[PDB]
Amino acid sequence: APDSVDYRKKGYVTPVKNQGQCGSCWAFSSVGALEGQLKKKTGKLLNLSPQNLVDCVSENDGCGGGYMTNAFQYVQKNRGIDSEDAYPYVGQEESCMYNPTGKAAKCRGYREIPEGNEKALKRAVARVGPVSVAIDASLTSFQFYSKGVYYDESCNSDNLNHAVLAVGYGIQKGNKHWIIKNSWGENWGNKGYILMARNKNNACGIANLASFPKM
């Protein structure tokens, strides 16, 4: 198995988007998972559409939040999700206007990972790639993160409130961390990324709501 892994230095990760004043982090979490899969599936790295997900997933609440699994299942039942080109992100909820001709990919179900199990999660990243994970990002230390392996004892493992993407895992100055792709902009944290703590007793509840799509 691998100690360090980074799907960024493998071309599996698209540019850091920026959700804006819309609680669509789930849409952005799902999309980034598929994106890494597609790149592995066909070798093509294109930006999938969070907006197709926001508008079209009736099980989710749009900007009011949603679950990645519902978003994955949707892409399966509808046999496809558009690209950003065919479906730009307005950052606001609107009626579903999905275009078949814009379809960039689809998925045949999803796999969920045992709750709290970071090893399973690490194994997922090593084999598959970017996996959608939900975490507690309320802590203002998170909102002011800039450098280093994040860790705060206040973080509540059951206060899952922000969906993000796991694009890797590794180590730094003795600290085994996770590499997280965030959807708050290129100007948040380190170039839109956070090196959250790993192993540290399921820090922030990272391994409780993770799932990747089957392509």
Ligand SMILES: *[C@@]1(=O)[C]N(C(=O)[C]([C][C]([C])[C])[N]C(=O)O[C]C2=[C][C]=[C][C]=[C]2)[C][C]1[N]C(=O)[C]([C][C]([C])[C])[N]C(=O)O[C]C1=[C][C]=[C][C]=[C]1
């Ligand atoms: C995120 O944007 C969307 N959210 C969700 O999708 C969550 C998913 C959890 C699994 C993590 N929704 C949810 O759990 O319930 C919704 C639901 C489910 C089923 C049916 C209907 C509805 C949460 C959203 N993120 C946030 O609220 C976070 C919270 C943190 C600040 C603590 N805010 C955020 O991301 O925005 C701040 C920001 C915005 C722009 C620039 C910088 C910061």
